Amino acid sequence: GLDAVRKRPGMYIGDTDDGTGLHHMVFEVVDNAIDEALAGHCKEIIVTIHADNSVSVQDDGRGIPTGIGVSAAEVIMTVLHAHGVGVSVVNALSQKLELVIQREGKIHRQIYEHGVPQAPLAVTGETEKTGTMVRFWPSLETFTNVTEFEYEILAKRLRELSFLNSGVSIRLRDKRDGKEDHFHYE
Ligand SMILES: CO[C@@H]1[C@@H](OC(=O)c2ccc(C)[nH]2)[C@@H](O)[C@H](Oc2ccc3c(O)c(NC(=O)c4ccc(O)c(CC=C(C)C)c4)c(=O)oc3c2Cl)OC1(C)C
């Protein structure tokens, strides 16, 4: 797993030099979010392009199962297959990834670096909401040439996903210039 995806990134995520793979990192995370909506638990997904060239995806689904050794969420984030290659591949190809889960009345947080957790999933507070939030900074040792996220590419796929999932609200936000969109087609 981990190490092997790192050694041959292209085979799993696509062209690492023309931007195809870069944007598909985002799509893989969104697809995971889409599932929680297809399951009948998620109603709105928010995708954000931060000014430090990172992307975050948040939803209001159940939240990735926590609790145990390692929590079920850590297994999902670090074990290959524990088009959809998983967040585990996205995590291994990110120089930094931030994971936040709201489930069973608690706020859980964890940081990853090139797929390795700096520490175990920790509880940092109470909450009465549920949902998952993943924010990742693409590894510049893997991705070359096109290294910055393009809004139009994201907007194009997010719209098609909206039409194929009538009912789920999808919002796109660019913090680099204030652009924003809301897809909710019929
Ligand atoms: C990357 O994660 C994805 C999710 O991505 C996301 O939700 C996601 C990623 C990024 C963003 C913003 N959203 C989403 O694809 C999808 O979600 C599921 C898919 C199935 C279940 C499920 O059967 C439940 N039933 C339980 O009783 C339960 C309780 C304890 C427990 O140990 C397990 C087994 C553990 C796992 C991980 C299935 C199940 C439940 O409670 O929750 C689930 C969730 Cl949250 O699959 C993941 C593998 C967990």
Side-chain angles (χ1 to χ4, degrees):
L2 209 179
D3 302 301
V5 326
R6 281 187 205 157
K7 188 159 56 187
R8 307 183 196 71
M11 303 310 285
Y12 306 89
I13 201 79
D15 194 308
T16 57
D17 191 88
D18 85 316
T20 302
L22 185 73
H23 294 89
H24 277 64
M25 289 272 282
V26 180
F27 296 150
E28 172 57 31
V29 183
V30 171
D31 276 349
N32 283 67
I34 291 300
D35 265 11
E36 267 313 79
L38 193 181
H41 300 288
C42 166
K43 293 162 181 50
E44 187 175 70
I45 301 160
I46 303 173
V47 183
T48 306
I49 297 184
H50 302 273
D52 62 346
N53 195 53
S54 66
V55 177
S56 70
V57 183
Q58 47 192 305
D59 71 21
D60 50 13
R62 290 166 294 187
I64 304 171
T66 50
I68 313 156
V70 305
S71 59
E74 280 198 45
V75 170
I76 289 293
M77 296 290 135
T78 66
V79 172
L80 190 64
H81 59 231
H83 181 51
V85 78
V87 170
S88 59
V89 162
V90 174
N91 184 27
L93 261 24
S94 298
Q95 49 182 53
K96 179 187 174 181
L97 188 154
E98 174 187 32
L99 192 249
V100 176
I101 303 160
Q102 295 181 72
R103 169 188 277 241
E104 228 59 11
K106 302 173 302 174
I107 302 177
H108 321 268
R109 300 172 176 287
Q110 204 177 197
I111 296 174
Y112 287 91
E113 286 180 294
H114 292 291
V116 184
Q118 272 185 21
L121 179 60
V123 178
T124 56
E126 302 248 63
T127 184
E128 70 163 54
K129 270 164 171 45
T130 57
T132 303
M133 198 300 289
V134 169
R135 185 172 167 181
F136 69 86
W137 289 254
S139 175
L140 285 179
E141 235 306 303
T142 294
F143 301 97
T144 55
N145 185 198
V146 183
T147 62
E148 303 202 316
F149 297 100
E150 191 188 315
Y151 192 100
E152 317 161 38
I153 288 179
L154 261 41
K156 173 177 167 58
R157 181 57 181 168
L158 286 188
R159 177 183 293 89
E160 294 159 353
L161 284 176
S162 181
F163 154 77
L164 292 178
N165 301 76
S166 303
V168 62
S169 179
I170 308 180
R171 296 179 177 288
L172 225 202
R173 303 167 178 173
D174 195 317
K175 301 189 69 182
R176 295 168 305 187
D177 68 322
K179 286 192 300 186
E180 187 180 358
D181 288 287
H182 188 183
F183 306 109
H184 208 318
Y185 294 100
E186 200 177 61

